[PDB]
Amino acid sequence: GIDPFTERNELQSAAEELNAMLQYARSEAVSQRRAISIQALKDKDWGKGLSIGVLASGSIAAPLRKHDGFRAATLTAKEKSAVEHLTFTANGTLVPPTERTFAICQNGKTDGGRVLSISQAGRIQLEPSSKAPQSCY
């Protein structure tokens, strides 16, 4: 596009917000020694609103924290398997401990897209900028 610096900046910020919310859910599960979940409110798009807290019957009745969604316009954050929620446990692992891959894209294209990974141990990592997603999912 006309301004590569801004494109990278907006994708970087969005990836950081999603990272921060996932890290918060994980750190709270570890601190509280209980299952703390994070749920995408809309479209299974983790950039359109998040709720964090105790999950029961598919809902978080009393969120510990909410995220209002990415600030920039054309962004999506979708997971490889289209998960709508994740649940961290007391030892930092997800249940189930399945590797997760989020693609953070602008305009539904992978150009300059970012990858945020969750390992089998539950560790959350923003992949370097050289790594683009295989798909925006």
Side-chain angles (χ1 to χ4, degrees), residues 79-105 107-108 110-122 124-130 132-133 135:
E79 204 274 326
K80 178 179 172 179
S81 301
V83 294
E84 170 263 6
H85 75 278
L86 292 173
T87 299
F88 289 96
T89 68
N91 74 351
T93 64
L94 287 171
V95 53
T98 301
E99 289 179 2
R100 305 301 185 180
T101 304
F102 290 88
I104 302 93
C105 292
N107 293 308
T110 65
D111 326 352
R114 306 300 302 275
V115 178
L116 186 58
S117 304
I118 309 180
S119 76
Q120 286 175 254
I124 304 142
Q125 183 65 58
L126 175 56
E127 301 292 347
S129 58
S130 56
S135 173

Side-chain angles (χ1 to χ4, degrees), residues 31 51 58 70 89:
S31 176
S51 181
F70 298 154
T89 68

